[PDB]
Each structure stands twice: as structure tokens, then as C-alpha cells.
Design goal:
A motif (BH2) lies at residues 126-141. One of its GO terms (cellular component) is Bcl-2 family protein complex. The protein is mostly helical and 142 residues long. The protein has one domain (1-142): Apoptosis Regulator Bcl-x. It is built from seven helices and no strands. Helix 1 (2-18) crosses helix 6 (108-130). The two termini are 21 Å apart.
Length: 142
């Protein structure tokens, strides 16, 4: 929803801050948000490769359209949706942001944000809602 757009902005801001970039280019939600930040960190610790293959497959330019992104993120979900995969979906957005800023393409950041939120609303929310909503996400990772 607007709520999902806000989860995504939070997470990406959190990740940009953490890694010493700027974030200026942009039941409770707060509990969801803290759960997600922590989820991200935890997951990035276990796999430090930063989806280099996936970022390579995308290789985002300002001419890159949503449909290309969607195809790449789909790769994450070959075997269906997961709590863990959603988290990877979030990290992936973060890496892509970082990678954008590194390439003096900080304009892509809020676009990636919109794409992520479209993707989540369209492809991810349905499974979320079906498996207990973000409450359950909280129970799990909180």
C-alpha cells in the first residue's frame, strides 16, 4: 500500500546510512521496520556476495525499465515466495541502490524504490497476506 512504499523507503534509507552513503535522495509499522533492518543485516552477514550476478544481469542505467528489474527479481522466487526470499528481495534493492550511488547515478535510487514497492505490492503481498501478514513477519524475525 502506502504502508509498503514506506517499508521500502525505510529499509533503503537504513542501508544507505549504514554503509555511509546519503539517504537524501528520497502490528505497528515501527516494529515491522526494525524487524526488517535486522533481517537484512543478519542475511547480509551469511552471504556477502551481494547478488553480483544479479546486479550484473540487471546492470541498471537510467534507460532501464521496470520490466527488466521484474525479470531479474523473479530469479529470487524461482521456487515460490519465502520470508527469507522477501528479505533477500530487500537486500537486493539495497545493493542496487548502493551500486547506483557508487556509479554517480544517485537518481536511480528513488526509482529502484518505486519498483521495489510495485513488486512487493504486486508479487509479494499476496503471499504475505496469505501466510499471516507482517505480524507473522514480526513473530519470526522481530
Amino acid at each position: 500500500s502506502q504502508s509498503n512504499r514506506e517499508l521500502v523507503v525505510d529499509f533503503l534509507s537504513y542501508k544507505l546510512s549504514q554503509k555511509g552513503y546519503s539517504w537524501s535522495q528520497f502490528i505497528p509499522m515501527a516494529a515491522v521496520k526494525q524487524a526488517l533492518r535486522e533481517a537484512g543485516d543478519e542475511f547480509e552477514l551469511r552471504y556477502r556476495r551481494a547478488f553480483s550476478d544479479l546486479t550484473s544481469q540487471l546492470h541498471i542505467t537510467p534507460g532501464t525499465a521496470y520490466q527488466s528489474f521484474e525479470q531479474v527479481v523473479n530469479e529470487l522466487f524461482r521456487d515460490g515466495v519465502n520470508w527469507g526470499r522477501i528479505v533477500a528481495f530487500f537486500s537486493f534493492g539495497g545493493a542496487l541502490c548502493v551500486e547506483s550511488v557508487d556509479k554517480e547515478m544517485q537518481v536511480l535510487v528513488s526509482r529502484i524504490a518505486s519498483w521495489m514497492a510495485t513488486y512487493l505490492n504486486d508479487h509479494l503481498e499476496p503471499w504475505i497476506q496469505e501466510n499471516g501478514g507482517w505480524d507473522t513477519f514480526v513473530d519470526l524475525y522481530g
